[model samples]
Target: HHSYTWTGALITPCAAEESKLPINALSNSLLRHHNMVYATTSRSAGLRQKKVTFDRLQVLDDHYRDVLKEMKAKASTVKAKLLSVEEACKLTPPHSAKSKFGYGAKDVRNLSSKAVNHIHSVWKDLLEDTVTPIDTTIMAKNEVFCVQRKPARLIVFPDLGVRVCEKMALYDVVSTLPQVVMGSSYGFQYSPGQRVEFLVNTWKSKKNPMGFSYDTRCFDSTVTENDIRVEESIYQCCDLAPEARQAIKSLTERLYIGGPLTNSKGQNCGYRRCRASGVLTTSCGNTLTCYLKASAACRAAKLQDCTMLVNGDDLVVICESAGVQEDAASLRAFTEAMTRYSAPPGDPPQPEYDLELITSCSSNVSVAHDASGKRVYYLTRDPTTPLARAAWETARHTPVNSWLGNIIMYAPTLWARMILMTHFFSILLAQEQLEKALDCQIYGACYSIEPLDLPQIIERLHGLSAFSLHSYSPGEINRVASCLRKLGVPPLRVWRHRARSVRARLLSQGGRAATCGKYLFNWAVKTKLKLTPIPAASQLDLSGWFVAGYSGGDIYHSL
Candidate 1:
């Protein structure tokens, strides 16, 4: 069946769209070639639609059935409860989309009579009906990037009230099921340190370690009707409240399986039969399906001791090498198995002996030296997109600031420290918004994070070694150097000189600002202070910080 069937209607925008990068005085300081930074607009949605719409066919095997059996066995252990309307309302983000029923996100959060009454009626209707195709909004995402142009990503989601109902039904299941079924292969559960440790241990466990990341071509499009039905079957295996089971079955038929797509202008845009990128189960469902397919493919290819790391559609497998020729043949067989399951590779997979050569979740493992000259393994990625987005965030104030998230997640990387830290901290200091809490997503979940607390936060998540990291891997350094040249971002020396100035200004403010300057910008100073763990890091409640990824999941931590 086709993924999407579009009408001859345009994907309309609510307001004026800016396709070019908006340059301010601070822009020149960070990037010289301002034109290289561009934002995707609604005008490119037609192209994206054409690219994502396709016919999918699947052929399952004994291996796939065996894997599914194992998954269901684990899933049966889960006992998920149906969330009350009040409980689900509290989970809604404050800035979430408003309902068509004459109320807003605030009204729902406050349990207003109008919003709560309509929500109850919607729930009642859900229990009564099981086959009505739910309506969803389809829009082209506005995202910034450098140099190469990509069609705007599409976001398809149901209305705000329906979204809350989705949380009421499946929130617990989505939160708990993936970890139970997939175990450690669930990449969202790992902090940067834990992720490095997992990759290291998995690589070490194999005698002749060979790894490769499988990039599924348009994964959402490749998902067939059978896949969605299979997903529901797995959910049905869970021990759930009777009402929750009814809601799950109803939602599966009405919304999750397929939905009618409407645009912002309230015009019919298309019909979607594939995965909706904006649903509560998007992250969890994608992880489960990807893991199942990869695990089955591993068995079919006869790969020994396969260890998979899955974050949504991104997947990496580390396994024992049979031999040079056999390894190549095994990878081709693995690709065929994945193709048979409908998750075909965008580019054919090539086996790599070096762990650093294989990238997953847009990052690869790299090494640096700490103060004691011990080799410290950390996660790092090419700086192109991060720097590009940083320039955009520097010029325009966005709702979700990616620079802060990158700094938090990739704190120890060379690009994050020299470029991202220096540029953003300088802007925050100038605007005197150091203490202001900014919203950023760590693992699909949003948190209101303050810039001043970054020192303690980084120490907690990545450890004190983040502040003292040096001698970064040459591959990582070269990637950053080329990215700077291509994007016209200044070199590390220029960033260092600028960081020292920013550091001095921050130190003048004292308190948390001084602490940030001392620790975060210590690399810029000739004689760095003795780096030690921050005492405040121990007191922070970071229990659910890295537990899951909620990309387009509408998850907020503060609520």
Candidate 2:
């Protein structure tokens, strides 16, 4: 059995090398493993397998290239046509208002008389498409990204029929009351996936009840005879729901009438007025004109008004003295009222003044900057304080050198190594130093190595080494290698020992060194090599392996 297994393995490798997989147990096992690993790891499969599939990948690449070429040609042509349409639309003048609004009252009356003629032409060429399904999957699966709660529903009455007009008026009244109440009393509650259905009723005359008929149809769909019905008939069509409904009662409760009535101390006389009385009228021809005007004016100013007018005739009575002082007084009274209501019952509150301070400290120098300019800087006037002197010393050191030493000596964890490589590489890339970036990539690759993937590890090292050689001259490459070696384990140990000794001295004397030698070395390497500077002290301590420091100063500050 052992010999058989060995033979099977040998045969599989030979078949793989020859670009042929025998239809046998050994081939199946290998294929299954490959497929499983590919699915499991998603993008992280070992490099060797990906390299081996180059031939297969090339076929896909060629096919996609062809498709892309065709798409590009078609796209350019269509884009030109779209641009022409946009230009035409922009150049066209606005249509006449009469044409825009559809017809005079006469045209509405004549709608029924002309219905038969119009119906015949409505479907014209559309009815011939018998191959189309009644309900296609595309229609069923269609999506609306954003929709209003209640959609606008159009009502059409044939010949201005009296009963139909009356019913329309009644609907307007019922809907209007709720709208007003909601606007004034209760706030709007918006809904989703709502639709509006237009109910069209035709009446021959006012006296004849049977002459009234109604039909319902979606505006986008074909309108048939069955869709039109007589008076006293109710038609229901589906529409996207109304977006929101304002609660009439709640809004009405908060409404107030009249303003700037002064009381004691010249403060505005304020009281909660009945919401019904707050409704007003305006110059607009419509009864709801006042509400519309007020809403429009407020909206134009982007102001939020708690009150709204309900009728067109209602007037606004702004007091002559309603200027800044009156407004301030009214605001003060309102605040007092709010405070009294908000506090726990029967709790005495101390009077407080609302004071605001504006500072002109834009020109103030930073602590580090101030300290750097002076030899003996004191955090405070009292120089005898040990804490003050230590802080002063920290501010005086060159920030770049101070931070680099800390990262190399103290940050020993794997996470720290990764962060340091990332920061170092980013800086190198920013400076367009491709060789240094490649080296950082090599360091990162080493961190990713596992015991099971020795070949992959070696391949990555070779790639990095090759990249280094190609990116830099022979002398430069040697220098870089030497620099990397110095930054490796041995030098790190020396820096750590020096840092420990310095830290001990700082602790014993109560006089902390601004930075250790390790930090200085790391900073010099990063800055001199044109690499990115380390950012946060926490990040450096936690994950940074090559840069370190406790100062809050940035790279620019260090410079």
Candidate 3:
């Protein structure tokens, strides 16, 4: 016998402000103003607060070809054969006969037999390849029952939503509760056992066994003698652990009087209410430590003391109960002693030195003390130190030239250009000695490449006469030119005309074209200047030749 009830409330605006306006005008103008304000404020604000949408950026055209190549390689290496649909279907669980028959008892024997056979077949398949078939169901149940039972899932990215489940497809329903217990005014001796009960009326409304309502009431039995029992239709009692019980026992020992006293709530016997009991009663002050430990222990132990009504009519049962009166007195005495020892001193006079500032400055080596007469070491003096070495390594790896080139290519963003140029110039300054020692052509053909200006690149290389110019054997050059033509670079005659114009321009600009005869060379004397350069005395000068050491200070100088 159960029933469901609906309860609600209505709120009306008071007439203080409404009395000032004319009734007829109020109805017309007030309504219009309300609508206009709501439309302009809330609706407009909601529209303005919408999230920015991210559109997928376009990838290079060759990217798809690279992806297809990778997929082909992976497919070629795959060894598993595909399973047939029949084989896949056999792995699924058998349908329940009760569901199929709609709870009818007719043909029960036949259906039971079919169900048993299906179960047997699954068991057989599970054990087919092994000498023993482990009962995983029993194992899982036992593991769950253990004191150190693993959580249903480990929460990995508590914010980003990644979690690991022991069983498949499980999710953690986390509670938004604080992890520590709050302080209470009550002495430990008056602590009452925490009992959570469900109302029969509320339970009936849920319909489903798993459904529950948040209408919970907590009471302190040691404080209230109301003896109302609150109609314990559904309730569960929990016992504190020995260690926790000891902590409560310690608190109780401090009480000199046992009589009831008024609390901040003006409720009698509130001070006599135990801290643990107060926590169990209060909704706002409940902490995570008490809740999680109690909830987890309740689930694992099935202690009838902590049971709550889910569904069906069952008499209220007390799960487990334990008392801790003895330890409370001793704990109370210890707490009192510690409190006295930690009490603030009477004197408020200033000290000779600022202890906090001195301690803070001495503790951190990275911070340099700025106080007068204080000694502090500057980091720049130790160039070979680990921190200095790491800084040098980072600066070396940063592609200063490439960064500067990007800025030069995208000069419309002046801020970006300035930042990159400043950074590159700073790096160049730091490594200036090494650069000069290597005979670096900072303002020449190589530096032109640093800006990524294609026209400048062509002009520099042509001036140096470093473009590929060797005549190929037989008709090889013509064949290569034909291939280039197919690649949309135009035929040999067009290239020849362009090359002649480039050479003429270089000569007009007072640049030499000496390395190759009537052709632009492609090879340059490559000098990896970032690496240690070989001694100049050890190599021949190759400054005007294609090969190393032909004219050289470095390989590039030869070209």
Which has the greatest TM-score? 1
Relative to the unseen true structure, what is the C-alpha lDDT of residue 492 in candidate 2, on a scale of 0 to 100?
A: 37
lDDT of 2 by residue, 299-350 (tens): 3322222232122222121111233444335434432332221111112222
Residue 45's lDDT within candidate 2 is 17
Clashing pairs in 1: 443-549, 444-550
lDDT of 3 by residue, 472-509 (tens): 22233343333333322234443344344433443343
In angstroms, give how far residue 26 of model 2 lies from its true place: 99
Q: What is the C-alpha lDDT of each candidate?
A: 0.90, 0.20, 0.21
Model 1, 177-236: lDDT tens digits are 888999999998899889999999999999999999999998888877788888989998
lDDT of 2 at 149: 14
TM-score, cand. 2? 0.13
Candidate 2 ranges beyond 4 A from true positions? 1-160, 163-182, 185-289, 299-306, 315-559
> What's the C-alpha lDDT at position 438 in model 3?
17
lDDT of 2 at 227: 14
CA error at residue 511 for candidate 1, angstroms:
1.1
Best by lDDT: 1
